[PDB]
């Protein structure tokens, strides 16, 4: 009974969560697991000020109102070559990673490690947040409050 979450450097607060290395989370547990790090979803004026900090991603993810890629560059594999918060049009289905907004988070860059998920509640499962640089955090916990999620 195991969970890993891959985070990023925060941007304004800003960061990227992919859960067990697959787009697996549905709006309503993306916003239960931003909650698990004293986080929500970010709105779009969010996002905007963390890509113009330097944050882009190759990966679609929830924000308030909407599924996004912030892209910096152009990459062809990555938003179809677009720059800038890159919105998701049309797709058949509803899972993909999130995306998350701590207020607490540094101004600018902030390419420290998460070392705790300080507001999971009491559960059974042993979730391990994942940084980019291979450092990890586990606790035993829950954060999905919907049963369809689990
Ligand atoms: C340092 O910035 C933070 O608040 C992060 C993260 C954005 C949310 C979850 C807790 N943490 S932490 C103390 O690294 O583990």
């Given at each position: 009974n195991q969970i890993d979450?891959?985070?990023?450097?925060?941007?304004a607060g800003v960061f990227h969560v992919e859960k067990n290395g697959r787009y697996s989370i549905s709006r309503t547990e993306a916003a239960d697991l931003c909650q698990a790090f004293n986080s929500?979803?970010?709105?779009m004026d969010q996002m905007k000020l963390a890509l113009s900090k330097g944050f882009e991603t190759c990966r679609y993810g929830f924000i308030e109102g909407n599924v996004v890629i912030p892209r910096i560059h152009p990459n062809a594999i990555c938003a179809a070559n677009h720059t800038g918060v890159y919105?998701?049009?049309?797709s058949n289905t509803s899972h993909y990673d999130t995306?998350?907004?701590?207020?607490?988070?540094?101004?600018?860059?902030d390419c420290t490690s998460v070392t705790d998920l300080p507001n999971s509640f009491d559960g059974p499962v042993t979730i391990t947040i994942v940084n980019r640089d291979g450092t990890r955090y586990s606790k035993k916990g829950e954060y999905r409050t919907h049963?369809?999620?689990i």
């Open positions: 979450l891959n985070v990023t450097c925060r941007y929500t979803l970010p709105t919105i998701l049009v049309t995306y998350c907004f701590n207020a607490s988070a540094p101004p600018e860059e049963q369809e999620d």
